[PDB]
Design a binder for these strands. Sequence first.
RNA 1: UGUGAAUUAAAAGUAAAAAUCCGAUAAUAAUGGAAUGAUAAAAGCUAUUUAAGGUAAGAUUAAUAAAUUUAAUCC
RNA 2: AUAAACAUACUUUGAAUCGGCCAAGUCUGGUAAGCAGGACUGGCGAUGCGGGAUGAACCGAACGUCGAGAUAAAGUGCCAAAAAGAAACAUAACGAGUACCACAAAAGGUAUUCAUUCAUAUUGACAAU
RNA 3: AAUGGCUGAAAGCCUCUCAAGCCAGAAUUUCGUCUAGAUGAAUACUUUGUCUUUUUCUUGUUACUUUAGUACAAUUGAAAAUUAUAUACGUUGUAUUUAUUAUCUCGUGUAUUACUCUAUCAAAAGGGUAGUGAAUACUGAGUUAACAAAAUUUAAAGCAUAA
Lengths: 130, 204, 173, 106, 153
Amino acid sequence: VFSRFVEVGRVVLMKTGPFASKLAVIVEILDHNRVLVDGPQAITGVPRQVVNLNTISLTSFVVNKVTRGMTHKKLCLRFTQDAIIKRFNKTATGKAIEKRILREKMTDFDKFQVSIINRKINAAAKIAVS
Amino acid sequence: STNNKVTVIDCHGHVLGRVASVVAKHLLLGQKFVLVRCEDLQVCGTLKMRLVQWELYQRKRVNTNPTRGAFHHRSPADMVRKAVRGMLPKNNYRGKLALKNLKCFEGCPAPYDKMKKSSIPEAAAIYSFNPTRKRTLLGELGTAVGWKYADVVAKNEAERKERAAKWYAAKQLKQKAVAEAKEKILADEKYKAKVAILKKFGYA
Amino acid sequence: MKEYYITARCTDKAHNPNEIFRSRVFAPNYVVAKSKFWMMLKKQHKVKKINAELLQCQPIFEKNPTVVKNYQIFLRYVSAGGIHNITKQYRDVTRVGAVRQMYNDLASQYRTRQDKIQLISITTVGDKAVKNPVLHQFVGHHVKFPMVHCKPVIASKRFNLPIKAGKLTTKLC
Amino acid sequence: KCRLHVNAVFMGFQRAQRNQYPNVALLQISGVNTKEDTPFYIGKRVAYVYKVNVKKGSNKPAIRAIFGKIVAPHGNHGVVKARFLHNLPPKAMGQNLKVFLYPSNI
Amino acid sequence: LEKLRKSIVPGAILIIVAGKYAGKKVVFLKQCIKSGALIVTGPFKINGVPLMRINQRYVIATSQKVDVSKVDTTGVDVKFFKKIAIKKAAFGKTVEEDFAKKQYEAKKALIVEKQKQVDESIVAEIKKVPYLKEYMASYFTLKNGDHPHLLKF
RNA sequence: UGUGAAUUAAAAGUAAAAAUCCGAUAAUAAUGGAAUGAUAAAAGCUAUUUAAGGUAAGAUUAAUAAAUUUAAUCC
RNA sequence: AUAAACAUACUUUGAAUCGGCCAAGUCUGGUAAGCAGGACUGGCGAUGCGGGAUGAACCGAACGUCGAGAUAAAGUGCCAAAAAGAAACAUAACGAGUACCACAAAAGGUAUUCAUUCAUAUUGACAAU
RNA sequence: AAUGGCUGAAAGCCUCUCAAGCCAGAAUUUCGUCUAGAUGAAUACUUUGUCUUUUUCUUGUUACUUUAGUACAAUUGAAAAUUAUAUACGUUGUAUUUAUUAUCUCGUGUAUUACUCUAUCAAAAGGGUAGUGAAUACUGAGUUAACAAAAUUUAAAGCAUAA
């Protein structure tokens, strides 16, 4: 049976546009193609808007007691109560999102040490195996 | 520089025409392509529909001399070459040179069975097809029209899966050993100076 | 598609200059909105541009472009056979947003170009007033479906490589 | 010694369906998949370095070059326009062109 | 006199991306006011890059900065660079083939070392930063996935 | 018992921050180039003087105000 | 109102020509014709260029020799320079695919999508038991 | 193929399917068989073992002859299958060209390798065993660079002898 559904309260992940790699919460379903994401603008910065399902991805979290057309005020309370930000950052995608931000601020000197250091570690770890 | 490498394309689960368009464009850009498993491509149409198109194709033949007539190659590796050749410049040095950098084989011969394989997301059958649209493998169509070597390739591919399966298992064991040996020396006290740099950028 | 509020008056012998014609016209730009507005006057009141003064032509903006509403567009279109009246429902957040759906849907199902359709009216209906067989399935509060066969998303054209490495997978998403 | 250039493919001249203008050559820089990554390369040096099998008694160099500059983008798929000192030989279509890192504005 | 880029400040480390010393890293001391070219030194004990002049269009300003005051640049002006330049044998000066350049390097060698007293300060400081001496002495390279429009220095 | 389109009270708010959408526009500018040129002084530009002016909008304060309203003295 | 001084009015001498053909929100004879003949205009003839694969007339636009830039008709999977996203009715078929253009009709289908009207719709309609 | 059927929904029933999935059915199609046939493969003998061109002898080919020039062993490139994919995760976001810290010396042993070479068993294998070398990690230290130069990828002449 399918695990992740496009329902009301499902936490989605924007994959393109100005809010790429920012969390959002579905609060309405117009049809099979468009949903209304209101990933709390006071928390993540995603405005209440209609987006196509080709631009987002589902996650393993659903916010509890979210009704369709929930207001921004009450939605924010349920978002922090579930602690989605805390839970999301421990997932494989959550760590991949922070990795990309970490790498994009490296300098040429920063990349020099990592390539040198990791090469020795990998070589040494291969030696240690009989 | 000079790109002497070969871009090996695994034609499994692709579309015949969509593969050719991407390959035939990049043959004109100096790249050398080898398309292994050109008998696993997919064409839109049931086996009944594909045979009608082949029957129409076989009709085109010079009336006064069939030896000069259009040559209808039944082998899937020659179906792909014909499809690619239709998307290349005709009757010029540029077109002929770009065609010399292309080869299919129905299976995976000795050099190209251990090279790194690529994929063409534009030509994948899971991105361009309705799942309920019936398709036809080139090998299955080739057997219907008179390609005799459909059983040699199926036998050769069978033993290539049994050789790779044991190589993959052996490689998995060594990788697990190296992975667990890296954790031990990542947590060593002497390597803290180096590791502290890696943790800063998230590598470790 | 943008919505406009257009008014005008007729100043000649036939029409008294104290009755103002208002309209709410959906047009790509205000020049087309006046063009639609003048035709409705000439074809319904014998009022011509050369004997009329336009007063106001202002855009109308959605009050709450964050609330999902069910619309009901009453319209008439011309086919090969004759002229018919249709009532099609749409779900969107803006009045102009639903109208563009109607124009694109009519031109696909009925093959009817835009210069055959006259939008009589557009209102907002209840949740149970929707009768479209497909659109009725998403009006409930407990709608839920898994989007299968997802194509993996690319952040931007920056990473759009022609040839990739390895294998390709869809997503249960 | 080191790699200080990015290979670009000399696809062909600026052309139409039945015409051709060899003054401007189109290049496909590696890793530039869109026209928004082009502003970095507008102005960078570009060289077509080829090899000539000279005879022993000839004093001409065995490695010659034609240089040029990237001047503007061409389409939405990160294709650039390059103008050289001398128009590139049409025998060099599909070959590699060194895209340097200077004039540097970094 | 050219207007140098805001990223190019004295003591910063630059990457030479053109010319004879392509791919090397140097330290920018100051700008030759009489010619507008930068006066850099990739300290000779580290990179082997001597004291020279390079136009600012052939260098990339990295974020790594060696600073270093008291560099003692009392000489090293337009006189010094014109003194150590190797000039041709004119036109009417007999024939003087081959040997002219070989002797020139020998006689100008001594003054070249004399002005390398500048490097005595940066060399000591460079060793303070871990992995920096290895970084300076090594050629700059563009590896796989190193797209110049994405790199930042 | 919960959500709630809309409306209402109080706090805050002189009602120009930033982001996205929607409308509106495109040109003044800054930084890199390209094609054809030029090289010398300027109805150049800069500094010092007095002072036509600054029509929402050069600033502030006052009277008051759904104001491109009226004054004052500073720049 | 608008435009017009290399404007306007001409005078003299003379060349070539009076086989024409095409298009159409036009017509007459004809079953019709790439047939015959007309009204108004624009073309081809006398005319190359970009596009329609190719084409006297179609579409854009009319040409001294060139450099750079926006454009026109029209295009953007490959030949072929140039696109990404959205919604649909299509597509189990030599079906669909760039006007003039190089073809298809009447009729039929418990095939399919949408809309209108009517009746049955429950405390129980239809199908089956 | 036409056609006749099976299970079976849509449409609680019915139905061979303008549905998925099957069967039977032609002087039919394709294998099999016959004729011509391109690129090819195996074996026998003659050679050669980094390479080419211009000449040149011969009926012709190969080896062969002369004068040069050129490189000299040692990190490259593989899971398979599915995609409504057992559950979980969604591991996000740049394929090839193109991922090595300048050169040399000094150093100690151990370990490792789809590394090179030798011997052997095998083998149309990124094979096993034994040894050697190379590179790397433990892991250092020291010399040199300033001007100049850092390139093959092939040229030119012959016929003694053998097949």
